[PDB]
Amino acid sequence: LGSMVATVKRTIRIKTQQHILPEVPPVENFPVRQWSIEIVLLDDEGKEIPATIFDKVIYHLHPTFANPNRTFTDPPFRIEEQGWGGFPLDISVFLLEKAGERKIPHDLNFLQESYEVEHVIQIPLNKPLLTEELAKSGST
């Protein structure tokens, strides 16, 4: 375990919603949908709170999107787009104080109108400002 001993775990929740845009012509008879993704943090009780432990989130979209790497700096880091197909994507989340990048695997899909996915990430405890922020969401 070594250096990994000096971390805490937190659960983040990725929230996705999508709906068809009828005013947009289907692509090969596939409807174009508006979709959104946001990110929240869970506390030790499972309540959603702002994910302020990240100072940046970058969505790395399918290369069929114009400038597919979309950067957000303010919680809940909400991205909105239009598209005709689902796809796996990586979400890069950057911890405060350059504590590290985490890549979170997401799948953007049209199986439900809205769906939530939880991911556990390990966060270091060596950056004072990040450690203070972490206290808001649970034990450290």
Binding site: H62, W84, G85, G86
Partner: peptide
Amino acid sequence: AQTARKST
């Protein structure tokens, strides 16, 4: 579609 997917 609900199963519409793109190739990677």
